[PDB]
Amino acid sequence: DRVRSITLGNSTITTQESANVVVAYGRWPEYLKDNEATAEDQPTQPDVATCRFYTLESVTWERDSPGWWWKFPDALKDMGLFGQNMYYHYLGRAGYTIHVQCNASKFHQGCLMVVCVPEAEMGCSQVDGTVNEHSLSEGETAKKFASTSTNGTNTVQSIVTNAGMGVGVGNLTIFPHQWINLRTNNCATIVMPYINNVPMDNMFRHHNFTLMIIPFVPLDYSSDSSTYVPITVTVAPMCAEYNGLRLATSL
Amino acid sequence: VVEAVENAVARVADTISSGPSNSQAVPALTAVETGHTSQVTPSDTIQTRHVRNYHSRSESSIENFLCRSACVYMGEYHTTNTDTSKLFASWTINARRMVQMRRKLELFTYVRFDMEVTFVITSKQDQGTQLGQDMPPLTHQIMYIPPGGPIPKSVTDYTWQTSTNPSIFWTEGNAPPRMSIPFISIGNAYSNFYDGWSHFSQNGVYGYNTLNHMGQIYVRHVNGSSPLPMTSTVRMYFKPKHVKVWVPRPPRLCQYKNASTVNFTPTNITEKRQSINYIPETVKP
Amino acid sequence: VVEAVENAVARVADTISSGPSNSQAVPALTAVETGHTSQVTPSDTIQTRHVRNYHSRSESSIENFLCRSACVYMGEYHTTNTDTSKLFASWTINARRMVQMRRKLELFTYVRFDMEVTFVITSKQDQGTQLGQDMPPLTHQIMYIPPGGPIPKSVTDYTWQTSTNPSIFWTEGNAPPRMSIPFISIGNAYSNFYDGWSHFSQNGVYGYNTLNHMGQIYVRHVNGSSPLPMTSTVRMYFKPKHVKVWVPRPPRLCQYKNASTVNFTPTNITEKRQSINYIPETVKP
Amino acid sequence: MGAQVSTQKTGAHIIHYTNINYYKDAASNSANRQDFSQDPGKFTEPVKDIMVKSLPALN
Amino acid sequence: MGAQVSTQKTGAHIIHYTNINYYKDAASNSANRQDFSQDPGKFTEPVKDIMVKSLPALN
Amino acid sequence: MGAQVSTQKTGAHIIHYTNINYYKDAASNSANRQDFSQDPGKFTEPVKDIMVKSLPALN
Amino acid sequence: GLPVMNTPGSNQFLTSDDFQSPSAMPQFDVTPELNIPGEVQNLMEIAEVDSVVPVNNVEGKLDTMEIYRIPVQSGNHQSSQVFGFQVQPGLDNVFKHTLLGEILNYYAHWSGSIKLTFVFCGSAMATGKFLLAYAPPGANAPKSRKDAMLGTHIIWDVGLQSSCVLCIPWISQTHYRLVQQDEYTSAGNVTCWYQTGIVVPAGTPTSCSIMCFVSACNDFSVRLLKDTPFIEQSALLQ
Amino acid sequence: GLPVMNTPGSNQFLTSDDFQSPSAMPQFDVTPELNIPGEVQNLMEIAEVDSVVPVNNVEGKLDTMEIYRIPVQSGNHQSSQVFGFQVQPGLDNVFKHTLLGEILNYYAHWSGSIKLTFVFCGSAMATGKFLLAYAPPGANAPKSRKDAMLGTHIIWDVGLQSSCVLCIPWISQTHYRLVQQDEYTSAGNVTCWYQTGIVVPAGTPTSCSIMCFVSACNDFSVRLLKDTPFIEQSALLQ
Ligand SMILES: CCCCCCCCCCCCC/C=C/[C@H](O)[C@H](N)CO
Ligand SMILES: CCCCCCCCCCCCC/C=C/[C@H](O)[C@H](N)CO
């Protein structure tokens, strides 16, 4: 009941302490069909060369950590053939399987929230200003929330209670989400379909969804337990499609 | 020919009678880490009587929640002036300047509907030392310009010919004008939030102003008159109908700052109380 | 009695799936000298997926393209004056003085339809040193005169009896007047271009003014009043319906010069660019 | 004449109305106020393996 | 009463309207907006001998 | 068209009317003026044991 | 023409009416409908989703995550109450900015049962039992475990299942209560007490925290729409 | 009379409405219908007719026929590009005054595939091959035959059939693009290169020209009528 295995392409994930799997709105990923298509050229479907697990860089969960976020896509634009296909085409489409891992002993305590947010438009820490692209995303490196109000030009207002969006963070449960309670489980798994208002889109211009990881109960331990506790993310695209082949763009 | 259409009302669930219990079924023990909300009722946890519940969730459907007129723009314009631009009013269409309708719409990521648009127009005699005249009733012209259309330069510009643009002419003292507008967007739905750029190099214009592009409105007096100055105010009201919405979002906590961005000032989660145990005494002689 | 009428919507063609090919069929090679336009699709030249297309060509039909009100004449007339001819307005009917409607109609050689005619009438108090009075609401008379009818000489001419001519009487403050007119021409269709003469010796009047001959319009105030001067403006709007058109033509390139001729000033084919290879860079950091 | 007769909103413990459409576009029709459907499981129960609610969640 | 009931314009992925004529002349009737026919071959293919489009045009 | 035809109030010693409902809510309908019922025994005879009125009340 | 007569109400603009109106774009052709995931049909659907409650809303914590955490610890603390609050889902500071309270503040009347879920976020070696009690109105709030013992309550045992659900059932003399609650439409209170106590082995933290989620049951409804008091402006362009 | 009530919109004049109206000429008898050749039923029918494109719109040629002629010649010119332009059928100078562009400029939205036909007008003894390429947007325009080789292209061989057709297929993330195109609704570019080169015998001209026609395919449509910016006046009687 607690064991799980997931296979995609030439990659496989096992786990012995999982809770369940969240299918975002009861909708599994799928390819675009004919009575919903607008673009006319025949699309390419690589199908094992792109649909497989890629692992990003880890972060260190310290006693005073506000939280982390990533933007998708553009966190996977340098990951093998998925990224190469992103560079050469005008239109792309894909769903995802996200898996978050964090293990600790039966003598530690803490609680993390793992949430996927579609169209997470963010605000600037200068009210009459605008954000730079660097402030929203550093590729495979995570951005970091703050515990107090922030200053600086072109940077995101990142105090963790407002989640960079002007809402109450305790309401983020309206989105697809799981929890990692250190006494209960050690991993979270979310399956996310393609969610947009058009059937396809350009993968450089538009961030489809943001992954947020926020500790609600801080990490705590006693006398001589282990101090280093990392968190790891692993994401696999699903049902990937591309249209509009031309010469490779450059940022 | 008559055709009968049957309406099904949807009332809420009854509560079933329940007695004592001593077993291994544990409805009250759950695990929130799964992302699952518990579907327990009072009948699982206490002893209950049977109730036939007749209440209906009719007024909390999306259509009844959204189908009410709301103001979205106000502007003024004069009959005579020395600025040549204060004789007509004009603006770009959206629903981002008045906070009530904006916040209400922003509980959802995507929306699609038709609109019913109403205008309310009032006039007034400007303050002066010499008052008193005999004017005929004033007439007003409202013209809508889709993007790419020619723009008026003054109140006598040729563009007020309105050969292909839709316009409304109206006279004071009558009922407020009204017309309906279909769902007009190059996408499959309107977008309230857009986490992206306008340029393929990840710069340029950020967010909402990349996608809207739905023309302008211009309004003028028609008489071309007024020996003594006068001022008019026009207000626009929107009402959506035949609605569909997708992807709910947490409601806005911080106060709005401008109409182009989601920028905000950090705000508290709620207001405070004396203690985590504090609850006021209300039963006293 | 009820009668059901079924409407058939006409959507555009789908695209069919197509794979690789190596044969002698050459869909891409043609010969324009024949006067024939090639009927090739993307599926003949590349590999394609199957698409179900739901778009409709509804708003580009002739009836939807032409059935919109457009201004065709504006004129002014006073309540009191010392010229005796500035107290009423009059003109000869056509659609050649306002360029938008004219150019739109002139994409076709021949046209035939009915019309819906609307009038918009406004008034104003003339500028002066002494203002202020108490006038009752003004009333207006519009009379149409087919060719050969008697012509009014002043605002009290007997011809305003309108025994057989159709007229409209109207009071300010009400909705704009309207009436419909059938297809009235001694030919089988209206002619927008006529490459001929009025006289059998190949001289006289050239072109359009030979064939139109559709009467005049006269407009006056009815009160016969105004201790202090006032001015009124009348505007006419045309909307065709039940339309048929024949023989399409290239659209007008040069700007119009007058209403009697097709005369023009030589104009360029388009505007220039830097080079035959020039295309601007838009993907830059 | 293409009339529609449907029931009015009333309470619990002569009641129908008629409607005619006048305009050629359906975007001119009145609001659709009498449709009451729901599917809450989309947001409250978005899990792959069904949870019975009388059984323990884990194990 | 000589009513006509026909379908409204809608989209793809209660919908009809009724009309009465009041005037004695048909030039008083409203516009005919719901007729969508075409015959493009009149202008694009005005040739005597049919051209197959998979075969060469000449020879 | 969901019309109702009912009789008019007249005297004693061509008489009916028609009605159409236009609004979606029954709180918009006109008053119910033609319903005449009574139950006076609720206030005039509220006793447990029935009293015959030809017999003496007591004994 | 046909003789008619105008009634009171002619030529007014009521902002909640429903009439037919002419289209300013005849025969416009709309974009086809796409089947996007996550379609919402009723606002009550949002109200049945749990959301975290800021129970620890005291001075100095209104802008930190500590506002969500309820503290508990080992040792003899049976006399100390854990928490208590009023049941006012749309008015009290504890509840008014959660998802349920946010939905309620658009309405004037509410009715139905409420769910409170409690989760224990200590180490896997901590054990303990708590008493969660709810008191209908009519008396003052209990000041000891013995008094609260007499109301509607559940005894929660911390184990491999980490979450317990206390259901507040609809006990009221009227069908609806006011969202802006007064003395007449009061609903009572909730309190928490130590049933046994928290016991831990050596090498484990001694202090821990509990969290609380709120949502609405399947008998819940609202009515009488109104504007919300949580958003405002001083001038246009905001 | 019958009791009624007036709604908002009474007594206005909307220029796109459709109502019944009284006739000022009762029982007029119209001229019978004649069956004239060439009846038009849809504006798209005009859009599927080819028309010549002024590709060579450089300074000094805007009022001459040379604006329509693309020049080519023999010798080693493989490094030189023949032509290139953006795909903006209603906005770019190259396309806005052709029949298709003229029709589009009355509308706000367009959708569908486009046909470009190329005809070679050299002597019957000239031979050669050309590469015609189209690049969807997202990158800058190619600067060499090798880069353009990676897009959607066709290799045209000059022979007894004198005309080649390059079809631009509808590749877009939205169903419609704006006639007034911006960065967001861009569509890419077209370029031409020498595949082999032009070879001629003695006694023949060495320079030649190519012409280009544009038309719309059978999946093409427009919407959202508007006034055109190509015609204007300063006063009446024009
Ligand atoms: C002659 C008077 C004509 C009046 C013209 C009013 C047209 C208004 C523009 C139509 C589009 C409005 C529909 C709603 C726009 C936004 O998508 C929504 N506010 C939410 O995004
Ligand atoms: C009492 C008011 C009566 C108003 C009289 C208006 C009549 C207008 C004359 C009828 C003919 C107009 C029909 C169109 C004329 C030309 O043929 C077209 N503009 C194109 O040639």
Short mmCIF file of C-alpha atoms and ligand atoms in Angstrom, two decimals, chain C residues 93-96 101 105 111 113-115 117 119 142-144 166-168 179 181-182 184-185 190-192 208 214 216-217 236 238, chain H residues 24-25, ligand 2:
data_model
loop_
_atom_site.label_atom_id
_atom_site.label_comp_id
_atom_site.label_asym_id
_atom_site.label_seq_id
_atom_site.Cartn_x
_atom_site.Cartn_y
_atom_site.Cartn_z
CA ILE C 93 -29.33 61.87 -54.02
CA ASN C 94 -26.31 59.59 -54.51
CA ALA C 95 -23.58 57.84 -52.51
CA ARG C 96 -20.52 59.57 -53.97
CA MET C 101 -19.18 53.94 -48.43
CA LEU C 105 -19.60 49.90 -53.03
CA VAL C 111 -25.33 46.25 -57.51
CA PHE C 113 -30.74 46.05 -53.26
CA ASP C 114 -33.31 47.76 -51.06
CA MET C 115 -32.35 50.51 -48.62
CA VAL C 117 -32.64 55.28 -44.60
CA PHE C 119 -31.78 60.69 -40.45
CA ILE C 142 -38.19 66.29 -44.81
CA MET C 143 -39.62 66.01 -48.33
CA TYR C 144 -38.42 63.82 -51.19
CA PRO C 166 -43.71 61.40 -49.27
CA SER C 167 -42.62 63.50 -46.31
CA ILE C 168 -41.56 63.02 -42.69
CA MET C 179 -37.97 54.42 -43.49
CA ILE C 181 -37.00 52.23 -49.86
CA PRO C 182 -37.28 49.55 -52.58
CA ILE C 184 -35.89 51.94 -57.85
CA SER C 185 -34.06 52.06 -61.16
CA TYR C 190 -27.62 50.09 -60.36
CA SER C 191 -24.44 50.92 -62.26
CA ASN C 192 -21.34 52.16 -60.45
CA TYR C 208 -21.72 58.24 -64.04
CA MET C 214 -33.02 59.78 -58.56
CA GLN C 216 -33.77 65.46 -54.56
CA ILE C 217 -34.25 65.97 -50.83
CA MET C 236 -28.35 60.96 -43.79
CA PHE C 238 -27.87 54.46 -45.81
CA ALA H 24 -42.35 55.11 -48.10
CA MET H 25 -43.51 53.63 -51.45
C1 LIG I 2 -39.50 61.27 -46.69
C2 LIG I 2 -38.06 60.79 -46.64
C3 LIG I 2 -37.76 59.93 -47.86
C4 LIG I 2 -36.28 59.64 -48.00
C5 LIG I 2 -35.95 59.42 -49.47
C6 LIG I 2 -34.67 58.63 -49.66
C7 LIG I 2 -34.65 58.03 -51.06
C8 LIG I 2 -33.23 57.82 -51.55
C9 LIG I 2 -33.23 57.55 -53.04
C10 LIG I 2 -33.48 56.08 -53.31
C11 LIG I 2 -32.33 55.48 -54.10
C12 LIG I 2 -31.15 55.16 -53.19
C13 LIG I 2 -30.60 53.77 -53.49
C14 LIG I 2 -29.12 53.83 -53.75
C15 LIG I 2 -28.61 54.71 -54.82
C16 LIG I 2 -27.47 54.28 -55.68
O1 LIG I 2 -27.93 53.42 -56.70
C17 LIG I 2 -26.45 53.54 -54.83
N1 LIG I 2 -25.90 54.48 -53.87
C18 LIG I 2 -25.34 52.90 -55.65
O2 LIG I 2 -25.40 53.33 -56.99
#
